[PDB]
RNA sequence: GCGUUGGAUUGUUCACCCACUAAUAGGGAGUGAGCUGGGUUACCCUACUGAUGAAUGUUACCGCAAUAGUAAUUGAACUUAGUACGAGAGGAACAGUUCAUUCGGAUAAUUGGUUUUUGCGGCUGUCUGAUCA
RNA sequence: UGAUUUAUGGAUUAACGAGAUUCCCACUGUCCCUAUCUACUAUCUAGCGAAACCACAGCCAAGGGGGCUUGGCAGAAUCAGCGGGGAAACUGGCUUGUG
């Protein structure tokens, strides 16, 4: 029975990585960079707080 | 097998092989005839030695040295033979021989033990009556409370003080009746 | 998930601490730590031992009865799930735990009345 | 395991080694197990074979019917006496240790237990789940 | 892969020395022969 | 061990078989010496070779024995007919000649170890080793024939078909292209071919089949010829021993055809050679293909032939086609019916069913001991709704398919809400809160719980009024 | 209306589920394809119920109940046990019982009107199970044969029992539970029928082992197809002589 | 001869050979490596360990034994201020390595990382990043004369941080510096929002979600200088094998006459830097909302920071992380949090996940009550509480 | 590349049985240092494992990575399937999903263990006039 | 060199012993399977202060029927543990699966 390193398991996980368990991650990323995007904006009306 | 196996399973095959040995030998043992036998001293062997001597004349164990001496072989001649025409099946199955003494889940009364030199070690639980007329004279002291009323339900957890308690109590209960 | 009363301390077990035990008899002991399991194997009582609710509401410390404490047994009649329901419930436990803690005050203020002229006597 | 035993077992505390005496709680007649062998094992440098809840175990009779004893025969743990630990957050156990005979195929032998079972091993197998007074 | 051990082509000055003995008992039995 | 033997896992010819046990010491136990050790170490290992060796030809000598099926007495049936088939002479000469192997190589391996043992020296070691092992070759060298004889019945006996003779069974005789593999074909899932030529089918085909909540087996004969009775070959021959070996009824396929040819002469001269046989074999004659002839316009001369298979004491005819269901169902159904009559006169004459019948057969009446009647329950909805289509366009979503279409069956995860009922689907989806500080909730709720804390707000307005907490 | 059906390899099924005239109950293996064989038979008609009990599975041999009442154990959680109420309708009474033991499929058979029980029960159970279902309650060993509720299987159509009961023990049963009974097998020999099988008035379920003079017998007495009133019993009482 | 049964050693080769690491920062060997259409983001984080604690949880996990029921299960609990951007380093490309060619700085730096490049601080006139910061402040250009070298050169580019330390319980009070690669394209993107980001915080939620497997890198937990038994699972000397017990009795004879280093002779273990991959986060708390540990069942108004506070630490006054298992470190000690290399596929990082109950009782001994409210109800009243 | 089990056993065990396991293959260099028979200065340096260290203007920070090392393994279940295949009897499969065994690395939330915190209690005898301590 | 013989039914042996052993019950960290705690040293420092032993001294593999030949490496100086070493096994390519 089989090991890690085997030549069938590891083409099937590569379509299952470029199937669905790469969408989340997609989605994951684009949601935390929105946050990231966002947060600068936070920290900017902070500055703008001690600008007036 | 060769000397030295084990002693639980091989007491097993020994002791069937001993058994299909008296199997044959009620069947064509003469009078004063010989069955000698070799067996591996098992928790049987005090069943079998007991029916022996309530079977037959002269059973005489060897204790032989010129074996291993680690192994339990003993060898075991029986001479003298009734011949029986009348035949005990009781002494033959080993069902009845297996008896099992006790020392000395369950939930009895409480009167049976106000009633009952070794008539105490078997009180493991009791149950609750509330309206019996020995009861409501029981009623009237110190009874039905301080853990009273849960030291009917169980026993077990009490202990060697409450023990004590309970057998005081029970001293009052029986001056009482 | 299920607090749990102590079966010797009395005290609530949270899930994943303490120790349960069963017997042959068939009766689950949940157990607060080690202190509470280990009186148990020792076959200790409780009601004798000072610091526990056994002992304690027995000996007439903390007030064993109350109305407010026929609110919260066991429920085998598990109804429907009504959302207002809960938010009935939720409120109604925030106010009972108040009475209780002012209950609680009550019968400690009665207890430890009387400590004053016993005091002045003293001197 | 083999034919009918149900399931995957979940990593139990492995308390009782070979060679444990333990009581018997069906209506056979057998009072007590001896544990010579374990099934489906590992092994490591003079480990003892450990058992557990849950297991199907190769094991003899030592007190009992003179029919049954002192030949080796498949049988369920349903005891443990040391401690293990739930996924639903609880540790427990039992107040002495127990086991059952059945078949290979795992189909009870008795028409009866005493006592309470492991639940593990209530829902692993069916048929000690069928004879079950008392679980928990 | 793994590559395995191989024999060397060294000279092992025994062997050699040995050969020649070995050489010299063989044409010795080639001239007790060689009369037939 | 019985029942179409497979465990005869297989046997080379004698050259690789050497091949196989002397290169397999050859890689498994050590190949090196030096002489510079110790004598000790020299002759042990050799006796640790020769050992390996021995014990790997024994125990291949035993997987051939232990694996072969010992064909006295392990059934009358199929002891017989590998008799008839497989040379009884040469196999039980064969399995002395590996016998005796066995018994020599055994031999001559411990006497060459009680040899070694004073082993002095690694020459002499050598040439004994070599010496004995060509030994034990030479005589595997002798057995060449019968090991590849014995190859060939293993692969034969391993195509052999499964019986138990002891069971209920019919055995179906007839010509040779009558219909037999229509026949079978209509009842059992067996294709056999249909062509019409004479030697069609060569051995004994079995099909499994069901009537009345029972199991039945169907044993097809290959077809028999004249060859009259004194001598014969092994196909007829074993269709005889089976005749005389399996307890079940007996069927001849008679054609009352057009087809099958040869001539009715040929046909009745055929059964009454076959006449003598027929002792306690509950046979039954069905004639084949009538619905094309009607058979009543038959002449008066096939008549009286008919009369005289007829004279015999105990015969039933039944009349059957290859074209329909009803008829050959019918025949079958009577059929099983003569072999229910069989199995009863051969059950009802040893009076012990009786004791332990009962307790099955005794299905209990209560008496109905009351006054109230207690209706099983039966729902009108159970009525309403149709039973399921397995196939159809249109049809129950069945959510297995949605698990597998959405989806898969270890994947996918069940909303076990919006399955039930509430007042309100909407808050179904909702999260109880199940937890408080302490105080588990759930044991706290329940209705009437607004007008016990009003009371307990009379309460506490009761002893606030009159002051009571100072 | 007999099916053979097989819990995930398993022919056991009664460990596994639960069967009233009113509703079902199974247990949350892998894959929803047992609950789609049931909802194949029974469509939208009842609920069939995922559900867990302890974390565990066993359903059919922890649980009890009828179409008038249902019981569970202690140890039930109060999540569980609003999923149940949440999930039937308010027509069963529904509730959780305090015991000594608690193998509730294995202790008792019952069907919508009558119920047999285990001797050693204690009396408190024995009221709440009368209060709540409204039946009558009987406390008896079947041929000595305990744990009745698992060596037993009981609808209101007929009766079922493992095959080594005596006669008188099938009559007077038969006399006290007020409906016809057989001794009999399942699934090939297996005496656990309560474990083994499970039943209804109106649905039999075995695993696929069982033979066809078992699905024969056990369709007939329980009567299952719409009409089969003891009718394919009278006619194959003669296949039970030949086969057995 | 060949010793009768072949059996594994005692230990692991491939953390070898045992040593003491240089410093109590774990260093990243590297990092996932691009996805150069997708916008920047970041690749890892610094936290500070505290403490562990525990779960319960409803499972959603088809196939399983525990799909929808309550399981329970160890976490751990990572301090993280979020953290301040101050300069990058530009990295190039040779067939020798990476190479670093270029740094640039962030024109205001605090007195922390200040603290942290002078070693004997107040000893110190304080002379750090004067003369850069006025490098700086003018018209400036040198700046842009490094970041247009970076923008025109320079494949991969990391960005310079320091944690926020100050704002923690801790008494360490000198920042902690790291290098974090980064997984967007477009390099002049990368450097702007590098330019844009400098003197600005980051928070993890811009990093970091749930149902998300990450990596931990840290360093380990001292024990000292210790013998092969308790350091490697080596068999204990049975009694009176002169010259010491718990130790390699027999390693040969005179053939072989030399050593192996394969036997676990004695050493250290531990303060060694350790990876431990495809940890679960659950959850992401935010120190500005007051109950981050109440959970979505429980509605009690609480917070994670258990009575007694952390035990060797103190109490939560800003974001945190909850993972499972046990992360390498001890109490107190930093973490350098990286995320995965890679896309993974275990269905079990996808659940969309729903923890049932944080428990915050009190470890500095055996906790029963999660908040003292809830105590003063149990207890009630006091001698001194009036 | 990884792995190769736990027990019982000698006036001539000889070659073994018992079971489990996926299996329970074979040999070298080994203890001429511990053990069994009817028995004829390991203190010098060496290498190894851990640990410091002037030197290159100094000191500190951040990193690269020449190289050397390398670890994962094994089995079972769910469907798939009672399908293919098979007269029957019997009955697999890679894709998907989940658990365990073994081995390793870390960890101390919880459970268990452990106590010189000699922390809080308890106890014998003696001593400090008795009590308290 | 020393329990007991002219039909006694002695001669068969009760008891006797820092003598030995089989089964069964009990017991326990011998073991699974190790974990922990204690006092001292070990360690460092102030002071006192040896001996054994010593051709030189030392890094390894193959070869030469510790040092030389050929190669691999070697970076000052050093500390603590360490127990592996410290002036009885190919005549001649031996041995292998096939009398």
Request: aromatic content about 8%; glycine content about 4%; proline content about 5%.
């Given at each position: 029975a089989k090991s890690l390193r085997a030549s069938s398991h590891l083409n099937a996980k590569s379509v299952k990585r470029r199937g669905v368990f790469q969408k989340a991650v997609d989605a994951r990323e684009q949601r935390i960079s929105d946050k990231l995007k966002e947060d600068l904006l936070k920290q900017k009306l902070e500055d703008l707080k001690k600008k007036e | 097998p060769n000397v030295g196996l084990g002693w639980v399973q091989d007491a097993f095959t020994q002791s069937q092989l001993t058994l299909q040995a008296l199997k044959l030998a009620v069947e064509n043992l003469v009078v004063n005839g010989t069955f000698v036998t070799k067996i591996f001293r098992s928790k049987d062997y005090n069943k079998l030695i007991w029916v022996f001597q309530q079977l037959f004349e002269k059973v005489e164990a060897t204790k032989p040295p010129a074996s291993r001496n680690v192994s339990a072989e003993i060898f075991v001649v029986c001479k003298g033979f009734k011949a029986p025409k009348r035949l005990d099946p009781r002494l033959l199955d080993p069902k009845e021989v297996f008896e099992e003494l006790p020392d000395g889940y369950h939930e009895t009364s409480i009167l049976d033990f106000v009633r009952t030199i070794s008539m105490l070690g078997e009180m493991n639980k009791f149950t609750i009556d509330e309206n019996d007329h020995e009861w409501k004279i029981l009623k009237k002291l110190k009874q039905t409370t301080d853990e009273f009323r849960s030291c009917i339900e169980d026993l077990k957890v009490l202990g060697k003080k409450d023990f004590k308690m309970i057998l005081r109590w029970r001293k009052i209960a029986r001056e009482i009746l | 998930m299920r607090i749990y009363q102590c079966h010797f301390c009395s005290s609530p077990c949270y899930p994943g601490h303490g120790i349960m035990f069963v017997r042959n008899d068939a009766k689950e002991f949940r157990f607060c730590r080690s202190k509470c399991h280990k009186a148990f194997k020792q076959r200790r009582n409780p009601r004798k031992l000072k610091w526990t609710k056994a002992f304690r509401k027995a000996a007439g410390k903390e007030l064993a009865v109350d109305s407010t404490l026929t609110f919260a047994q066991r429920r085998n009649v598990p109804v429907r799930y009504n959302r207002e329901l809960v938010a009935t419930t939720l409120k109604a436990m925030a106010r009972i735990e108040e009475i209780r803690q002012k209950r609680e005050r009550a019968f400690y203020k009665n207890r430890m009345r009387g400590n004053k002229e016993k005091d002045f006597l003293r001197d | 395991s083999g034919n009918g035993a149900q399931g995957t077992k979940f990593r139990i505390s492995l308390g009782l080694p070979v060679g444990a005496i333990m009581n018997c709680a069906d209506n056979s007649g057998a009072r007590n197990l001896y544990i010579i062998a374990v099934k489906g094992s590992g092994s490591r440098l003079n480990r003892l074979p450990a058992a557990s809840l849950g297991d199907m175990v190769m094991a003899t009779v030592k007190k009992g019917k003179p029919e049954l004893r002192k030949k080796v025969m498949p049988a369920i743990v349903v005891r443990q006496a040391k401690s293990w630990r739930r996924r639903d957050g609880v540790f427990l156990y039992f107040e002495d240790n127990a086991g059952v005979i059945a078949n290979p195929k795992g189909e009870m032998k008795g028409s009866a237990i005493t006592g309470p079972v492991g639940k593990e091993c209530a829902d692993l197998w069916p048929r000690v789940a069928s004879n079950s007074g008392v679980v928990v | 892969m793994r590559v395995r051990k191989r024999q060397s082509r060294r000279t092992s000055t025994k062997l050699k020395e040995g050969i020649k003995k070995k050489a010299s008992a063989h044409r010795?039995?080639?001239?007790?022969?060689?009369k037939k | 061990?019985?029942?179409?033997?497979?465990?005869?896992?297989?046997?080379?010819?004698?050259?690789?078989?050497?091949?196989?046990?002397?290169?397999?010491?050859?890689?498994?136990?050590?190949?090196?010496?030096?002489?510079?050790?110790?004598?000790?170490?020299?002759?042990?290992?050799?006796?640790?070779?020769?050992?390996?060796?021995?014990?790997?030809?024994?125990?291949?000598?035993?997987?051939?024995?232990?694996?072969?099926?010992?064909?006295?007495?392990?059934?009358?049936?199929?002891?017989?007919?590998?008799?008839?088939?497989?040379?009884?002479?040469?196999?039980?000469?064969?399995?002395?000649?590996?016998?005796?192997?066995?018994?020599?190589?055994?031999?001559?391996?411990?006497?060459?170890?009680?040899?070694?043992?004073?082993?002095?020296?690694?020459?002499?070691?050598?040439?004994?080793?070599?010496?004995?092992?060509?030994?034990?070759?030479?005589?595997?060298?002798?057995?060449?024939?019968?090991?590849?004889?014995?190859?060939?019945?293993?692969?034969?006996?391993?195509?052999?078909?499964?019986?138990?003779?002891?069971?209920?069974?019919?055995?179906?005789?007839?010509?040779?292209?009558?219909?037999?593999?229509?026949?079978?074909?209509?009842?059992?899932?067996?294709?056999?071919?249909?062509?019409?030529?004479?030697?069609?089918?060569?051995?004994?085909?079995?099909?499994?089949?069901?009537?009345?909540?029972?199991?039945?087996?169907?044993?097809?004969?290959?077809?028999?010829?004249?060859?009259?009775?004194?001598?014969?070959?092994?196909?007829?021959?074993?269709?005889?021993?089976?005749?005389?070996?399996?307890?079940?009824?007996?069927?001849?396929?008679?054609?009352?055809?057009?087809?099958?040819?040869?001539?009715?002469?040929?046909?009745?001269?055929?059964?009454?050679?076959?006449?003598?046989?027929?002792?306690?074999?509950?046979?039954?004659?069905?004639?084949?293909?009538?619905?094309?002839?009607?058979?009543?316009?038959?002449?008066?001369?096939?008549?009286?032939?008919?009369?005289?298979?007829?004279?015999?004491?105990?015969?039933?005819?039944?009349?059957?086609?290859?074209?329909?269901?009803?008829?050959?169902?019918?025949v079958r159904n009577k059929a099983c019916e003569k072999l229910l009559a069989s199995r009863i006169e051969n059950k009802l004459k040893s009076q012990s069913r009786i004791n332990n019948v009962l307790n099955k057969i005794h299905v209990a009446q209560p008496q109905a001991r009351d006054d109230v009647k207690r209706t099983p329950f039966i729902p009108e909805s159970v009525k309403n709704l149709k039973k399921y289509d397995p196939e159809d366009p249109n049809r129950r979503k069945l959510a297995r398919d949605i698990e597998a279409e959405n989806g898969g069956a270890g994947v996918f995860n069940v909303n076990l809400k919006d399955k039930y009922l509430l007042e309100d689907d909407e808050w179904k989806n909702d999260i109880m809160p199940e937890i408080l500080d302490g105080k588990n909730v759930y044991d706290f709720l329940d209705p009437e719980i607004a007008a016990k804390l009003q009371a307990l707000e009379e309460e506490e307005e009761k002893l606030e009024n009159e002051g009571f907490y100072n | 209306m007999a099916t053979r059906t097989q819990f995930e390899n398993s022919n056991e099924i009664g460990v596994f589920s639960k069967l009233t005239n009113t509703y079902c109950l199974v247990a949350v293996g892998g894959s929803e394809n047992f609950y789609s064989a049931f909802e194949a038979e029974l469509g939208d008609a009842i609920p069939i119920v995922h559900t867990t009990i302890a974390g565990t599975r066993i359903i059919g041999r922890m649980t009890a109940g009828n179409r008038r009442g249902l019981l569970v154990p202690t140890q039930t959680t109060d999540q569980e046990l609003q999923h149940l109420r949440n999930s039937l309708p308010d027509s069963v009474k529904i509730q959780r019982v305090e015991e000594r033991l608690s193998a509730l499929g294995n202790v008792i058979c019952?069907?919508?009107?009558?119920?047999?029980?285990?001797?050693?029960?204690?009396?408190?159970?024995?009221?709440?199970?009368?209060?709540?279902?409204?039946?009558?309650?009987?406390?008896?060993?079947?041929?000595?044969?305990?744990?009745?509720?698992?060596?037993?299987?009981?609808?209101?159509?007929?009766?079922?029992?493992?095959?080594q009961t005596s006669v008188q023990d099938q009559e007077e049963l038969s006399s006290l539970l007020q409906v016809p009974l057989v001794a009999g097998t399942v699934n090939r020999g297996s005496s656990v029928v309560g474990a083994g099988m499970v039943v209804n008035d109106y649905l039999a379920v075995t695993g696929l082992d069982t033979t066809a003079p078992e699905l024969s017998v056990i369709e007939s007495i329980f009567r299952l197809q719409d009409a089969q009133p003891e009718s394919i019993s009278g006619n194959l009482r003669d296949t039970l002589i030949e086969t057995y | 001869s060949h010793r009768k049964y072949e059996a594994p050693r005692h230990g692991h080769l491939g953390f070898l050979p045992r040593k003491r690491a240089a410093s109590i920062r774990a260093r990243v060997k590297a990092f996932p490596k691009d996805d150069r259409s997708k916008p920047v983001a970041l690749t890892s984080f610094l936290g500070y360990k505290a403490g562990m604690t525990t779960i319960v949880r409803d499972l959603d996990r088809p196939g399983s034994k525990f799909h929808k029921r309550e399981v329970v299960e160890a976490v751990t609990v990572v301090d993280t201020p979020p953290v301040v951007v101050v300069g990058v380093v530009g990295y190039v490309e040779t067939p020798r390595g990476l190479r670093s060619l270029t740094t640039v700085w962030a024109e205001h730096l605090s007195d922390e990382v200040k603290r942290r490049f002078y070693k004997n601080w107040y000893k110190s006139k304080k002379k750090a990043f004067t003369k850069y910061s006025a490098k700086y402040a003018q018209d400036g250009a040198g700046i842009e004369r490094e970041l247009a070298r970076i923008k025109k050169y320079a494949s991969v580019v990391r960005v310079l941080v320091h944690t926020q330390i100050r704002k923690t319980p801790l008494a360490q009070k000198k920042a902690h510096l790291a290098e974090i690669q980064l997984n967007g394209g477009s390099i002049s993107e990368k450097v702007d929002w590098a330019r844009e980001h400098f003197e600005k915080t980051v928070a993890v939620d811009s990093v970091f979600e749930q149902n998300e497997m990450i990596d931990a890198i840290a360093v380990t937990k001292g024990h000292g200088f210790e013998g092969v038994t308790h350091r490697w699972g080596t068999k204990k000397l049975p009694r009176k094998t002169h010259r010491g017990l718990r130790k390699v009795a027999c390693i040969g004879a005179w053939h072989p006459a030399h050593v192996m280093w394969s036997v676990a002779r004695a050493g250290q273990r531990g303060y060694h830097s350790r990876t431990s991959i495809n940890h679960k986060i659950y959850r992401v708390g935010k120190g500005d909302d007051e109950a981050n540990g109440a959970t979505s069942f429980d509605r009690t108004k609480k917070t994670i920071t258990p009575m007694g506070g952390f035990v060797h630490y103190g109490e939560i006054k800003n974001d945190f992380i909850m993972v499972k298992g046990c992360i390498p470190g001890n109490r107190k000690r930093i973490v350098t949090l990286r995320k995965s290399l890679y896309t993974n596929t275990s269905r079990k990082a996808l659940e969309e996940v729903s923890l049932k109950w944080i428990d915050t009782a009190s470890k500095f001994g055996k906790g029963r009550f999660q908040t003292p409210a809830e105590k003063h109800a149990f207890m009630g009243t006091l001698k001194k509480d009036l």
């Open positions: - | - | - | - | 010795k039995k080639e001239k007790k022969m060689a | 061990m019985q029942l179409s033997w497979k465990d005869i896992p297989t046997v080379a010819p004698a050259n690789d078989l050497l091949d196989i046990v002397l290169n397999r010491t050859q890689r498994k136990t050590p190949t090196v010496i030096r002489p510079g050790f110790k004598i000790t170490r020299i002759r042990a290992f050799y006796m640790r070779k020769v050992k390996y060796t021995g014990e790997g030809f024994v125990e291949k000598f035993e997987d051939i024995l232990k694996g072969f099926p010992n064909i006295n007495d392990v059934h009358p049936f199929h002891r017989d007919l590998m008799d008839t088939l497989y040379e009884k002479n040469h196999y039980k000469i064969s399995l002395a000649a590996i016998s005796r192997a066995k018994s020599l190589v055994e031999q001559v391996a411990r006497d060459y170890v009680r040899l070694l043992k004073f082993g002095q020296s690694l020459f002499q070691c050598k040439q004994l080793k070599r010496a004995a092992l060509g030994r034990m070759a030479t005589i595997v060298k002798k057995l060449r024939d019968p090991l590849a004889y014995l190859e060939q019945v293993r692969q034969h006996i391993g195509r052999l078909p499964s019986i138990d003779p002891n069971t209920r069974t019919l055995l179906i005789c007839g010509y040779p292209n009558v219909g037999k593999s229509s026949f079978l074909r209509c009842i059992t899932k067996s294709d056999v071919d249909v062509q019409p030529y004479a030697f069609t089918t060569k051995s004994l085909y079995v099909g499994h089949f069901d009537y009345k909540y029972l199991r039945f087996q169907a044993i097809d004969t290959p077809g028999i010829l004249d060859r009259p009775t004194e001598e014969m070959n092994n196909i007829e021959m074993q269709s005889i021993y089976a005749i005389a070996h399996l307890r079940s009824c007996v069927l001849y396929f008679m054609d009352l055809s057009e087809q099958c040819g040869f001539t009715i002469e040929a046909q009745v001269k055929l059964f009454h050679s076959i006449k003598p046989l027929f002792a306690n074999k509950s046979v039954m004659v069905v004639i084949n293909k009538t619905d094309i002839i009607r058979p009543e316009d038959l002449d008066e001369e096939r008549a009286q032939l008919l009369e005289s298979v007829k004279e015999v004491p105990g015969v039933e005819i039944m009349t059957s086609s290859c074209q329909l269901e009803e008829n050959v169902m019918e | 019952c069907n919508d009107y009558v119920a047999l029980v285990h001797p050693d029960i204690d009396r408190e159970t024995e009221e709440l199970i009368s209060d709540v279902l409204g039946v009558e309650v009987f406390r008896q060993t079947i041929s000595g044969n305990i744990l009745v509720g698992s060596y037993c299987s009981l609808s209101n159509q007929g009766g079922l029992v493992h095959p | -």
